[PDB]
DNA sequence: TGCATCCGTGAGTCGGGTAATAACGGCCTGTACGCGTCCGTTTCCGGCACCCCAAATGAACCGTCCCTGGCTCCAAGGTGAACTCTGGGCGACGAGTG
């Protein structure tokens, strides 16, 4: 428990109340699961009816799953400049 | 007292974005939102106290801008001649014509 609520309180950038990590971790499983009994990648409206919510609420916790990137990684194909110097 | 062992220095210029895991009830409340009722506001129909206001309704009115009277006082129209081309008619004479 604690490790889960701790996990759940600081594992991302952008906090994520535990009310919807364990929602959208939820998701992701039963996603994954479905994938493999299927043999391809469940259909929103499947998600949407595995979850039991409306296909919007599903498409806005996908949404809402995406995690911040690094300002500073390196864009090029080499080592020559950051993604900070691509951003107006 | 060297000695290896890091240890940290430095080394040129104008295609983009890629992912895990067991987690799951159950109860509290905090702020935003929704329901029903109630009341000051303001918004619009109507009336005289009258405030009158006015183009519209009666004059003159008389100077001026229209008529009539007639009187002229002059230049256009009508009247001659003769005359100087303008022209018609006429006579003379010949050399190609018969």
Known sequence: QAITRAMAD????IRI???????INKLGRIQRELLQDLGREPTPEELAKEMDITPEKVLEIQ???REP????????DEGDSQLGDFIE
Not at 10 to 13: G, K
Not at 17 to 23: A, L
């Open 17 to 23: 109340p535990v009310h919807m990590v364990e929602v």
């Open 69 to 76: 990137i690094s300002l500073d990684q390196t864009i090029g």
């Open 63 to 65: 949404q809402y799953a």
């Open 10 to 13: 600081q594992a991302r950038t």
